[PDB]
Coordinates of C-alpha atoms and ligand atoms in Angstrom, one line a residue:
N1 CA 89.5 254.2 140.3
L2 CA 87.4 253.5 137.1
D3 CA 90.3 251.3 135.7
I4 CA 89.5 248.8 138.6
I5 CA 85.6 249.1 138.5
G6 CA 84.8 250.3 134.9
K7 CA 84.9 246.8 133.4
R8 CA 82.1 245.6 135.8
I9 CA 80.0 248.9 135.2
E10 CA 80.5 248.9 131.3
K11 CA 79.3 245.2 131.2
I12 CA 76.0 245.9 133.2
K13 CA 75.4 249.0 131.0
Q14 CA 75.6 246.7 127.9
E15 CA 73.1 244.2 129.4
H16 CA 70.5 247.0 129.9
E17 CA 71.6 249.5 127.1
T18 CA 67.8 249.6 126.4
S19 CA 67.3 250.9 130.0
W20 CA 70.5 252.9 131.0
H21 CA 70.2 256.6 132.1
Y22 CA 72.1 258.9 134.6
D23 CA 69.0 259.7 136.7
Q24 CA 69.3 263.3 138.0
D25 CA 67.4 262.8 141.3
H26 CA 69.6 260.0 142.9
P27 CA 69.8 260.0 146.7
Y28 CA 73.5 258.9 146.9
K29 CA 76.0 261.2 148.6
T30 CA 79.0 259.2 149.9
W31 CA 78.5 256.4 147.3
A32 CA 79.4 257.2 143.7
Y33 CA 76.3 256.8 141.4
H34 CA 76.8 255.6 137.8
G35 CA 73.4 254.8 136.2
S36 CA 70.0 253.0 136.4
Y37 CA 67.9 250.3 134.7
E38 CA 64.3 248.8 135.1
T39 CA 63.3 245.6 137.1
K40 CA 60.5 245.1 139.7
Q41 CA 60.3 242.7 142.8
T42 CA 61.7 242.3 146.4
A43 CA 60.0 237.5 150.6
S44 CA 59.2 238.2 154.4
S45 CA 59.0 236.5 157.9
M46 CA 56.3 233.7 158.1
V47 CA 54.9 232.1 161.3
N48 CA 55.8 228.5 162.2
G49 CA 52.3 227.0 163.0
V50 CA 53.8 223.9 164.8
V51 CA 55.7 226.1 167.4
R52 CA 52.8 228.6 167.7
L53 CA 50.1 225.9 168.4
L54 CA 52.3 224.6 171.2
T55 CA 53.1 228.0 172.8
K56 CA 49.5 229.4 173.2
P57 CA 50.1 231.6 176.3
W58 CA 52.6 233.7 174.2
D59 CA 49.7 234.5 171.7
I60 CA 48.8 237.6 173.9
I61 CA 52.5 238.7 174.7
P62 CA 53.2 241.7 172.4
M63 CA 57.0 241.2 172.6
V64 CA 56.5 237.7 171.1
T65 CA 53.7 238.5 168.6
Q66 CA 55.2 241.8 167.2
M67 CA 58.4 240.0 166.3
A68 CA 56.5 238.3 163.4
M69 CA 55.2 241.6 161.9
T70 CA 56.8 243.9 159.3
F71 CA 68.5 253.3 158.5
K72 CA 69.8 252.6 154.9
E73 CA 70.7 256.3 155.7
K74 CA 73.5 254.7 157.9
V75 CA 75.2 252.9 154.9
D76 CA 75.3 256.4 153.1
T77 CA 77.3 258.2 156.0
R78 CA 81.1 258.9 155.9
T79 CA 84.1 258.1 158.2
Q80 CA 87.0 260.6 158.6
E81 CA 90.6 259.3 157.9
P82 CA 92.5 258.5 161.1
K83 CA 95.5 260.7 162.3
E84 CA 99.1 259.5 161.5
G85 CA 99.6 258.3 165.1
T86 CA 96.5 256.0 164.9
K87 CA 97.5 254.6 161.5
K88 CA 101.0 253.7 163.0
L89 CA 99.4 252.0 166.0
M90 CA 97.1 249.9 163.8
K91 CA 100.0 249.0 161.4
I92 CA 102.4 247.7 164.2
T93 CA 99.4 245.9 165.9
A94 CA 98.0 244.3 162.7
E95 CA 101.6 243.2 161.7
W96 CA 102.1 241.6 165.1
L97 CA 98.6 240.1 165.3
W98 CA 98.9 238.3 161.8
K99 CA 102.3 236.8 163.0
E100 CA 100.7 235.5 166.3
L101 CA 97.7 234.0 164.4
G102 CA 100.2 232.6 161.8
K103 CA 102.6 230.9 164.3
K104 CA 100.7 227.6 164.4
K105 CA 98.6 227.9 161.1
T106 CA 99.4 227.8 157.3
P107 CA 97.4 230.0 154.9
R108 CA 96.1 227.9 152.0
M109 CA 93.6 227.8 149.2
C110 CA 90.2 226.0 149.8
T111 CA 88.9 223.2 147.4
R112 CA 85.9 222.9 145.1
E113 CA 85.2 219.6 147.0
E114 CA 85.0 221.8 150.2
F115 CA 82.8 224.4 148.5
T116 CA 80.5 221.7 147.1
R117 CA 80.2 220.0 150.6
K118 CA 79.2 223.5 151.8
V119 CA 76.3 224.0 149.3
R120 CA 75.2 220.4 149.6
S121 CA 74.3 221.0 153.3
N122 CA 72.8 224.6 153.1
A123 CA 75.3 227.1 154.7
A124 CA 74.4 230.8 154.5
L125 CA 76.8 231.7 151.6
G126 CA 74.6 234.4 149.9
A127 CA 73.9 233.5 146.2
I128 CA 71.3 235.1 143.7
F129 CA 68.8 234.0 140.9
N130 CA 69.5 233.6 135.9
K131 CA 71.1 230.3 134.4
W132 CA 70.6 227.6 137.2
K133 CA 67.8 227.1 139.8
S134 CA 69.6 226.4 143.1
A135 CA 73.3 226.3 144.1
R136 CA 73.1 222.5 144.3
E137 CA 72.4 222.5 140.5
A138 CA 75.1 225.1 139.3
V139 CA 77.8 223.2 141.5
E140 CA 77.0 219.8 139.7
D141 CA 77.2 221.5 136.2
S142 CA 80.5 222.0 134.2
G143 CA 79.3 225.2 132.5
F144 CA 79.3 227.0 136.0
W145 CA 82.9 226.1 136.8
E146 CA 83.7 227.4 133.2
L147 CA 82.3 230.9 134.1
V148 CA 84.3 230.5 137.4
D149 CA 87.5 229.6 135.3
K150 CA 87.0 232.8 133.1
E151 CA 86.7 235.2 136.2
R152 CA 89.6 233.3 138.0
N153 CA 92.1 234.0 135.1
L154 CA 90.9 237.7 135.0
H155 CA 91.8 237.9 138.8
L156 CA 95.3 236.5 138.2
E157 CA 95.5 239.1 135.4
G158 CA 94.6 241.7 138.1
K159 CA 91.2 242.5 136.6
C160 CA 87.5 241.9 137.5
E161 CA 84.2 241.6 135.4
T162 CA 81.4 239.8 137.3
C163 CA 82.2 240.3 141.1
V164 CA 79.2 242.6 141.9
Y165 CA 77.3 243.1 145.3
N166 CA 73.5 243.2 145.5
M167 CA 72.5 245.3 148.6
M168 CA 69.3 244.5 150.7
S169 CA 71.6 247.1 161.7
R170 CA 71.9 244.5 158.9
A171 CA 72.6 244.7 155.1
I172 CA 73.4 241.2 153.4
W173 CA 75.5 242.0 150.2
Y174 CA 74.7 238.9 148.0
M175 CA 77.0 238.0 145.1
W176 CA 76.5 235.3 142.3
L177 CA 77.7 231.8 143.5
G178 CA 80.7 232.2 141.2
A179 CA 82.2 235.3 143.0
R180 CA 81.3 233.6 146.3
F181 CA 83.5 230.6 145.4
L182 CA 86.5 232.9 144.5
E183 CA 86.2 234.7 147.9
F184 CA 86.0 231.2 149.7
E185 CA 88.9 229.8 147.5
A186 CA 91.2 232.7 148.6
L187 CA 90.1 233.5 152.3
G188 CA 88.0 230.4 153.3
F189 CA 91.1 229.1 155.3
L190 CA 90.4 231.7 158.0
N191 CA 87.1 229.9 159.0
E192 CA 87.8 226.4 157.6
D193 CA 91.1 226.1 159.6
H194 CA 89.8 227.9 162.8
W195 CA 92.3 230.9 162.8
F196 CA 89.9 232.7 165.4
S197 CA 89.5 229.5 167.7
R198 CA 90.3 230.4 171.3
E199 CA 93.4 228.0 171.2
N200 CA 94.8 229.8 168.2
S201 CA 93.8 233.6 168.7
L202 CA 93.4 233.7 172.6
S203 CA 90.6 236.4 172.3
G204 CA 88.5 234.6 169.7
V205 CA 85.6 232.1 170.3
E206 CA 85.1 230.8 166.7
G207 CA 83.6 227.3 166.9
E208 CA 83.4 227.3 170.8
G209 CA 79.6 226.9 171.1
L210 CA 77.0 228.6 173.3
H211 CA 77.7 225.9 176.0
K212 CA 81.3 227.2 176.3
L213 CA 80.8 231.0 176.1
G214 CA 79.8 231.4 179.8
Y215 CA 82.8 229.3 181.0
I216 CA 85.1 231.5 178.8
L217 CA 83.6 234.7 180.4
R218 CA 84.1 233.2 183.9
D219 CA 87.8 232.4 183.1
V220 CA 88.3 236.0 182.0
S221 CA 86.6 237.1 185.3
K222 CA 89.4 235.1 187.2
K223 CA 92.1 237.5 185.8
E224 CA 93.4 240.3 188.2
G225 CA 92.0 243.6 186.7
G226 CA 89.2 246.2 186.6
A227 CA 85.5 245.9 185.5
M228 CA 84.4 243.9 182.4
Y229 CA 83.7 246.3 179.5
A230 CA 81.3 245.3 176.6
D231 CA 80.9 248.4 174.5
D232 CA 79.0 247.8 171.2
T233 CA 80.0 249.8 168.1
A234 CA 77.4 251.9 166.2
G235 CA 77.2 250.1 162.8
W236 CA 80.6 248.4 162.8
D237 CA 80.5 247.3 159.1
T238 CA 79.8 251.0 158.0
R239 CA 82.9 252.2 160.1
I240 CA 85.5 249.9 158.5
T241 CA 88.1 252.4 156.9
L242 CA 90.5 251.9 154.0
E243 CA 93.3 251.8 156.7
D244 CA 91.4 248.7 158.2
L245 CA 91.0 247.0 154.8
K246 CA 94.8 247.6 154.2
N247 CA 95.8 246.1 157.6
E248 CA 93.5 243.1 157.0
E249 CA 95.1 242.6 153.5
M250 CA 98.5 242.0 155.2
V251 CA 97.4 238.3 155.7
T252 CA 98.6 238.0 152.0
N253 CA 102.2 238.6 153.3
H254 CA 102.1 235.1 154.8
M255 CA 100.9 233.5 151.4
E256 CA 102.7 232.4 148.2
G257 CA 102.2 231.4 144.5
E258 CA 98.7 231.4 143.0
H259 CA 97.0 231.6 146.4
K260 CA 98.7 234.9 147.2
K261 CA 97.7 236.3 143.8
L262 CA 94.1 235.1 144.2
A263 CA 93.9 236.7 147.7
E264 CA 95.5 240.1 146.7
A265 CA 92.8 240.3 143.9
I266 CA 89.9 239.6 146.3
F267 CA 91.2 242.4 148.7
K268 CA 92.2 244.9 145.9
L269 CA 89.3 244.4 143.4
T270 CA 86.2 243.3 145.5
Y271 CA 86.9 244.7 149.1
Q272 CA 88.9 248.0 148.6
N273 CA 86.8 248.7 145.4
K274 CA 83.2 247.6 145.2
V275 CA 80.3 247.6 142.7
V276 CA 76.8 247.4 144.2
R277 CA 73.3 247.2 142.6
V278 CA 70.6 248.7 144.9
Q279 CA 66.7 248.6 144.2
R280 CA 64.8 251.9 144.5
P281 CA 61.0 252.7 144.4
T282 CA 61.2 256.0 142.3
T283 CA 61.3 250.3 140.7
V284 CA 64.8 251.0 139.1
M285 CA 68.3 249.4 139.8
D286 CA 71.1 251.8 140.8
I287 CA 74.8 250.8 140.0
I288 CA 76.8 252.6 142.9
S289 CA 80.4 252.2 144.0
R290 CA 82.6 252.7 147.1
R291 CA 86.1 252.0 148.4
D292 CA 85.6 251.9 152.3
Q293 CA 83.2 249.9 154.6
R294 CA 82.7 246.1 155.0
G295 CA 81.4 244.3 151.9
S296 CA 82.6 240.7 152.0
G297 CA 80.6 237.4 152.2
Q298 CA 79.3 236.9 155.8
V299 CA 81.8 234.1 156.9
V300 CA 84.9 236.1 155.8
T301 CA 83.2 239.3 157.3
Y302 CA 83.1 237.5 160.7
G303 CA 86.8 236.6 160.6
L304 CA 88.0 240.0 159.5
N305 CA 85.7 241.8 162.0
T306 CA 87.1 239.6 164.8
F307 CA 90.7 240.4 163.6
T308 CA 90.2 244.2 163.4
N309 CA 88.1 244.2 166.7
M310 CA 91.0 242.4 168.4
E311 CA 93.4 245.1 167.0
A312 CA 91.1 247.9 168.1
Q313 CA 90.8 246.5 171.7
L314 CA 94.6 245.8 172.1
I315 CA 95.1 249.5 171.1
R316 CA 92.4 250.8 173.6
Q317 CA 94.2 248.6 176.3
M318 CA 97.6 250.2 175.3
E319 CA 96.0 253.7 175.7
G320 CA 94.7 252.8 179.2
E321 CA 98.1 251.5 180.3
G322 CA 99.8 254.8 179.1
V323 CA 101.9 252.9 176.5
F324 CA 101.5 256.0 174.1
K325 CA 100.6 259.7 174.9
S326 CA 98.8 261.0 171.7
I327 CA 97.2 259.8 168.5
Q328 CA 98.5 262.9 166.6
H329 CA 102.0 261.4 166.1
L330 CA 103.9 258.3 167.5
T331 CA 107.6 259.2 168.5
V332 CA 110.3 256.6 167.4
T333 CA 110.7 255.5 171.1
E334 CA 106.8 255.3 171.4
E335 CA 106.9 252.8 168.4
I336 CA 109.6 250.7 170.2
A337 CA 107.5 250.9 173.5
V338 CA 104.4 249.6 171.6
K339 CA 106.4 246.8 169.9
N340 CA 107.9 245.8 173.3
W341 CA 104.4 245.8 175.0
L342 CA 103.0 243.6 172.2
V343 CA 106.0 241.2 172.3
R344 CA 106.2 241.1 176.2
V345 CA 102.5 240.9 177.3
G346 CA 100.4 241.0 174.0
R347 CA 99.3 237.3 174.4
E348 CA 98.3 237.9 178.1
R349 CA 96.3 241.0 177.0
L350 CA 94.5 238.9 174.2
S351 CA 93.5 236.3 176.9
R352 CA 91.6 239.1 178.9
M353 CA 89.2 239.4 175.9
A354 CA 86.3 237.4 174.3
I355 CA 85.7 238.7 170.7
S356 CA 83.1 237.4 168.2
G357 CA 83.2 239.7 165.1
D358 CA 82.1 243.2 166.1
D359 CA 81.1 241.9 169.7
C360 CA 83.7 242.1 172.6
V361 CA 84.2 241.7 176.4
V362 CA 87.4 243.1 177.8
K363 CA 88.8 242.8 181.3
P364 CA 91.6 245.3 181.2
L365 CA 94.5 245.7 183.7
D366 CA 92.4 248.4 185.5
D367 CA 89.7 251.1 185.0
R368 CA 91.9 253.6 183.1
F369 CA 90.5 251.7 180.1
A370 CA 87.0 253.3 180.7
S371 CA 88.2 256.8 179.6
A372 CA 90.8 255.6 177.1
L373 CA 88.7 256.9 174.1
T374 CA 91.0 258.9 171.7
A375 CA 92.3 255.9 169.6
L376 CA 88.9 254.1 169.6
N377 CA 87.0 257.2 168.3
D378 CA 89.8 258.2 165.9
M379 CA 89.8 254.6 164.4
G380 CA 86.0 255.4 163.7
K381 CA 84.8 252.6 166.1
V382 CA 82.4 255.0 167.9
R383 CA 80.5 253.3 170.8
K384 CA 76.6 252.9 170.5
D385 CA 74.2 254.8 172.9
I386 CA 76.7 256.9 174.9
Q387 CA 78.2 260.4 174.3
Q388 CA 81.5 260.3 172.3
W389 CA 83.7 261.4 175.3
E390 CA 81.6 259.9 178.2
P391 CA 83.6 257.1 180.0
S392 CA 82.4 253.5 179.5
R393 CA 80.2 251.9 182.3
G394 CA 81.9 248.5 183.1
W395 CA 80.2 245.4 184.7
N396 CA 81.3 244.1 188.2
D397 CA 79.7 240.6 187.8
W398 CA 80.6 238.3 184.8
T399 CA 76.9 237.0 185.2
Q400 CA 75.6 240.4 184.1
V401 CA 77.9 240.9 181.1
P402 CA 76.1 240.7 177.7
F403 CA 77.9 238.7 174.9
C404 CA 76.6 237.3 171.6
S405 CA 72.9 238.3 172.5
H406 CA 73.1 236.3 175.9
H407 CA 74.1 236.5 179.6
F408 CA 75.3 233.5 181.6
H409 CA 74.1 231.9 184.9
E410 CA 76.0 229.7 187.4
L411 CA 73.7 226.7 188.2
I412 CA 74.5 224.2 191.0
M413 CA 73.3 220.6 190.2
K414 CA 71.7 218.6 193.1
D415 CA 75.0 216.6 193.2
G416 CA 77.0 219.9 193.7
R417 CA 78.6 220.0 190.2
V418 CA 78.6 223.5 188.5
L419 CA 77.0 224.3 185.1
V420 CA 77.6 227.7 183.4
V421 CA 74.5 228.1 181.1
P422 CA 73.5 230.6 178.4
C423 CA 70.3 232.7 178.8
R424 CA 68.4 235.5 177.3
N425 CA 64.9 237.0 177.7
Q426 CA 62.5 234.2 177.0
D427 CA 60.2 236.4 174.8
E428 CA 63.1 236.6 172.3
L429 CA 63.7 232.8 172.3
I430 CA 59.9 232.0 171.8
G431 CA 59.4 234.9 169.3
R432 CA 62.3 233.6 167.1
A433 CA 61.2 229.9 167.2
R434 CA 57.8 231.1 165.9
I435 CA 59.3 232.5 162.7
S436 CA 60.3 230.7 159.4
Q437 CA 62.1 232.3 156.4
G438 CA 61.0 231.8 152.7
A439 CA 58.2 230.3 150.5
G440 CA 57.0 226.7 149.9
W441 CA 57.4 225.1 153.3
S442 CA 55.5 221.8 153.5
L443 CA 53.8 220.9 156.9
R444 CA 56.7 218.3 157.3
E445 CA 59.5 220.9 156.7
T446 CA 57.7 223.3 159.2
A447 CA 57.5 220.5 161.8
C448 CA 61.2 219.6 161.3
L449 CA 62.2 223.4 161.9
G450 CA 60.1 223.4 165.1
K451 CA 62.0 220.3 166.2
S452 CA 65.4 222.0 165.6
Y453 CA 64.3 224.9 168.0
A454 CA 62.9 222.3 170.5
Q455 CA 66.2 220.3 170.6
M456 CA 68.3 223.6 170.8
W457 CA 66.1 224.5 173.9
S458 CA 66.6 221.1 175.5
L459 CA 70.5 221.4 175.1
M460 CA 71.1 225.1 175.8
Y461 CA 67.9 226.4 177.7
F462 CA 66.9 223.3 179.7
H463 CA 67.1 225.5 182.9
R464 CA 64.1 227.6 181.7
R465 CA 60.9 225.8 183.0
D466 CA 58.7 227.0 180.1
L467 CA 61.3 226.0 177.4
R468 CA 62.0 222.5 178.7
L469 CA 58.1 221.9 178.8
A470 CA 57.6 223.5 175.3
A471 CA 60.7 221.5 173.9
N472 CA 59.2 218.2 175.3
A473 CA 55.8 219.1 173.8
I474 CA 57.2 219.9 170.3
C475 CA 59.3 216.6 170.3
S476 CA 56.1 214.7 171.4
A477 CA 54.1 216.5 168.6
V478 CA 56.5 215.8 165.7
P479 CA 57.2 212.2 164.5
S480 CA 60.1 210.8 166.6
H481 CA 62.2 209.8 163.5
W482 CA 61.7 213.1 161.4
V483 CA 65.1 214.9 161.1
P484 CA 65.5 218.5 162.4
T485 CA 66.2 221.1 159.6
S486 CA 67.2 224.7 159.1
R487 CA 67.7 226.4 155.6
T488 CA 70.9 228.5 156.8
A489 CA 78.5 228.1 167.4
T490 CA 78.5 224.3 166.8
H491 CA 74.9 222.9 166.4
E492 CA 74.8 219.7 168.6
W493 CA 70.9 219.7 168.6
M494 CA 70.8 219.0 164.8
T495 CA 70.7 215.1 165.3
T496 CA 68.1 212.3 165.8
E497 CA 70.2 211.0 168.7
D498 CA 68.4 210.9 172.1
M499 CA 68.7 214.4 173.6
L500 CA 69.7 213.1 177.1
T501 CA 72.7 211.3 175.5
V502 CA 73.6 214.5 173.7
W503 CA 73.2 216.5 177.0
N504 CA 75.6 214.1 178.7
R505 CA 78.2 214.4 175.9
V506 CA 78.1 218.3 175.8
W507 CA 77.7 219.2 179.5
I508 CA 79.6 216.3 181.2
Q509 CA 81.9 214.1 179.0
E510 CA 83.4 216.7 176.6
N511 CA 83.1 219.7 179.1
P512 CA 86.7 220.6 180.1
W513 CA 85.3 222.6 183.2
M514 CA 83.7 219.4 184.6
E515 CA 86.2 217.2 186.5
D516 CA 83.7 214.6 187.7
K517 CA 82.5 212.6 184.5
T518 CA 79.6 210.7 186.3
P519 CA 76.7 210.7 183.7
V520 CA 73.2 212.0 184.4
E521 CA 70.6 209.0 184.1
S522 CA 67.4 211.2 183.9
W523 CA 66.2 214.8 183.0
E524 CA 65.1 215.1 186.7
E525 CA 68.9 215.2 187.7
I526 CA 69.2 218.3 185.4
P527 CA 68.4 221.5 187.4
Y528 CA 66.4 224.7 186.6
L529 CA 67.2 228.4 187.5
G530 CA 65.6 229.5 190.8
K531 CA 61.9 230.2 190.2
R532 CA 62.4 234.0 190.8
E533 CA 65.5 234.1 188.4
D534 CA 63.3 232.3 185.7
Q535 CA 60.6 235.0 186.1
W536 CA 63.2 237.8 185.9
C537 CA 64.4 236.2 182.6
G538 CA 60.8 236.2 181.3
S539 CA 59.1 233.0 182.6
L540 CA 55.3 232.9 182.7
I541 CA 55.5 230.4 185.6
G542 CA 52.9 231.7 188.2
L543 CA 50.4 233.0 185.5
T544 CA 46.9 231.2 185.1
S545 CA 47.4 231.2 181.2
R546 CA 50.7 229.2 181.9
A547 CA 49.1 226.8 184.5
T548 CA 46.3 225.9 182.1
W549 CA 48.8 225.4 179.1
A550 CA 51.0 223.1 181.3
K551 CA 48.0 221.1 182.8
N552 CA 46.3 220.6 179.3
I553 CA 49.6 220.1 177.3
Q554 CA 48.6 216.6 175.9
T555 CA 45.5 218.3 174.2
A556 CA 47.8 220.8 172.4
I557 CA 50.2 217.9 171.4
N558 CA 47.2 215.9 170.2
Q559 CA 46.0 218.9 168.1
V560 CA 49.3 219.0 166.2
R561 CA 49.5 215.2 165.8
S562 CA 46.0 215.3 164.2
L563 CA 47.1 217.9 161.7
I564 CA 50.4 216.0 160.8
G565 CA 48.4 212.7 160.7
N566 CA 49.0 209.0 161.5
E567 CA 52.8 208.9 162.1
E568 CA 55.0 207.2 164.8
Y569 CA 55.1 209.7 167.8
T570 CA 56.8 209.4 171.3
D571 CA 55.5 210.9 174.6
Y572 CA 58.5 212.9 176.1
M573 CA 56.3 214.6 178.8
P574 CA 56.8 211.9 181.5
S575 CA 60.6 212.8 181.4
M576 CA 59.4 215.7 183.7
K577 CA 58.4 215.0 187.4
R578 CA 54.9 216.6 187.1
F579 CA 53.6 214.3 184.2
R580 CA 55.1 211.1 185.7
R581 CA 52.1 209.6 187.6
Ligands
LIG601 N1 83.6 259.8 152.3 S1 84.8 259.0 152.9 O1 84.7 258.9 154.3 O2 85.0 257.9 152.1 C1 86.1 260.1 152.6 C2 86.9 260.7 153.7 N2 87.8 261.5 153.1 C3 87.6 261.5 151.8 C4 88.3 262.1 150.7 C5 87.9 261.9 149.4 C6 86.8 261.0 149.2 N3 86.1 260.3 150.2 N4 86.6 260.6 151.5
LIG602 N1 90.2 224.7 142.2 S1 90.6 224.5 143.7 O1 90.4 225.7 144.4 O2 89.9 223.3 144.2 C1 92.2 224.2 143.7 C2 93.1 224.4 142.6 N2 94.4 224.2 143.1 C3 94.4 224.0 144.4 C4 95.4 223.8 145.3 C5 95.0 223.6 146.6 C6 93.6 223.6 147.0 N3 92.6 223.8 146.1 N4 93.0 224.0 144.8
LIG603 N1 88.3 254.8 154.5 S1 88.0 256.3 155.0 O1 86.6 256.4 155.2 O2 88.9 256.6 156.1 C1 88.5 257.3 153.7 C2 89.4 258.4 153.8 N2 89.6 259.0 152.6 C3 88.9 258.2 151.7 C4 88.8 258.4 150.3 C5 88.0 257.5 149.7 C6 87.3 256.5 150.4 N3 87.4 256.3 151.8 N4 88.2 257.2 152.4
LIG604 CL1 77.5 244.4 187.3
LIG605 ZN1 85.9 239.3 140.0
LIG606 ZN1 68.8 234.7 182.4

């Protein structure tokens, strides 16, 4: 208890001994409170004027315009401890899953060179403000790596001093760059070495890309079985138990030497015991503590979410197939039956799933899965927006299944070849592209972020009439040689390569579901959804506002070119039939 966290607490107390006080009216219930101190400050969501000026029809669509405007009483709930039968099911399953994931991989420590290369191209790692300005500065300075060195040797000594979370259905738990390095050093291999790739994990999709997720769902659909289930969990990160953290920690059983010691420390001292500083208006800073729930950096969180979700869904599959009878207790022969199931058909059962962190699609052996709820609820993974004991509603058509905020269309090219393409409501796509994050964006940086969205649209959403037209307009309106940016799925659109060449590489050449490798020699060979399907998915095609926008597009492009000024521009609009004489 306070042996593990006291050092961190004591140290913060001493840096604000002018301010410390055990406030009487603290709202914390399931979090342990410890004390308070004075600060005062927070950033918010800003509009990208380049994208907004080139999407005028959406200026009167509330779903688009309201996205730019703007429960922490879910983080302060409790989760009951699972029954002994559930704990046994999770231990056997976790044990077996780490061995499967380990068969063709070697756990290993990640390098400062790898961490530096991360900072020096802006990954979302989750640092905080006072000694150095940016991450890029602290990395390049020897004094930083000295503070790292101190903390590191405390971790090998089985102690912690500076590894503290700053809180803010989200809740990003930022740490100082230092504690982020130590997390990445110990557990970075899970992401860096693709442990949850589809090849390695069979259920996972890590690194597959939005242009492969539809093909993966269609391959699951080919399995003999029942409906496709895609039940979301209510607040997955808040439902991670101590039993889940212990089963995740068993990855250390496959490690050795310093790496093993460094990993056991991250699990024991920063994951299964945490220290958090939370801002409160009544503006003070509350040091609070907890043992359960997910508080890692967001890349390790993805990997351990995927692991624990794969485990949870194999157990729900076991329940549907009648492998065990009751969560209360597992008989000795039930243990053997569960081991024999895992070892005999476990790999086949993983291949009937697509799992991306807390998000899943399962095509089970049959529809007994739908009412197999006892283990899932008792593991605390309670389904969102359905009564606790109401059977799951499955999907009969893989093209209706939601996964990673999308659905997927089958799209026949004029030449008969078949594309499986990602899609979501077009108001969501346009609303997002109209938003920037943070202060001090130049016009140039704003234009380059617009261009990132435009190239993503050309590559992923080419089949939506409004997005191909808007993407061509943004790329005409931004100087042709300016490089797409973003301050924080493989990102093939982040390039100054010609987008038709990239389309051909992604959808034809490197596409394992495309046998005929004949290139496309124009955008006009690349199809759209049916006009009615485009409208169902949110197209404005058929509206007068949209007709005027399309007809007068060069006037909008010219308005943005006039603001940016005298630069080298390209006209991409004649790549579309209707602007080509
Ligand atoms: N609030 S909790 O879900 O972390 C929880 C469940 N059972 C216990 C027993 C002691 C402390 N906490 N606890
Ligand atoms: N400081 S470090 O994390 O780069 C490091 C130290 N020792 C090793 C061994 C393998 C990889 N990295 N590594
Ligand atoms: N992880 S849990 O919610 O199942 C749980 C059960 N019993 C305790 C005691 C302290 C913290 N968490 N906890
Ligand atoms: Cl359906
Ligand atoms: Zn630490
Ligand atoms: Zn659609």
